[PDB]
């Protein structure tokens, strides 16, 4: 009977190890998923890095920047910088 209880002890210990393995594998799979999010960010970095500065600024910033500048001019504010910065903070949350 003692030997049978020893076998139960080791069986449950090894089932604990199987649980810990299943957790470790789930952790590793989530770790690979996270890494794939990181490699997505890597691809985005490569995409931006591809673009020489003139073109990168022109495409990404200038249309939005031009539009906001136009609206700031229509404001003729006491400070363009403050208005434009706030305007961008409001717009870009929607505007891409």
């Amino acid at each position: 009977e003692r030997l049978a209880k020893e076998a139960a002890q080791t069986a449950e210990l090894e089932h604990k190890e199987a649980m810990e393995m299943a957790e470790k594998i789930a952790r590793w799979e989530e770790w690979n998923k996270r890494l794939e999010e990181v490699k997505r960010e890597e691809r985005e970095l490569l995409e931006v890095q591809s673009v020489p500065l003139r073109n990168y600024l022109m495409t990404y910033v200038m249309p939005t920047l031009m539009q906001g500048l136009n609206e700031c001019c229509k404001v003729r504010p006491e400070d363009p910088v403050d208005f434009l910065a706030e305007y961008l903070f409001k717009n870009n949350p929607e505007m891409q």
Binding site: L46, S50, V51, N55, M58, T59, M62, P63
Partner: peptide, 28 residues
Amino acid sequence: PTFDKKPLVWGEDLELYSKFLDRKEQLR
């Protein structure tokens, strides 16, 4: 990592496309 010298159509650059339109009207 992948690398390109992307060819740009004038329509893609607002500045160039503006210059194009201005020149077009000037010629016309």
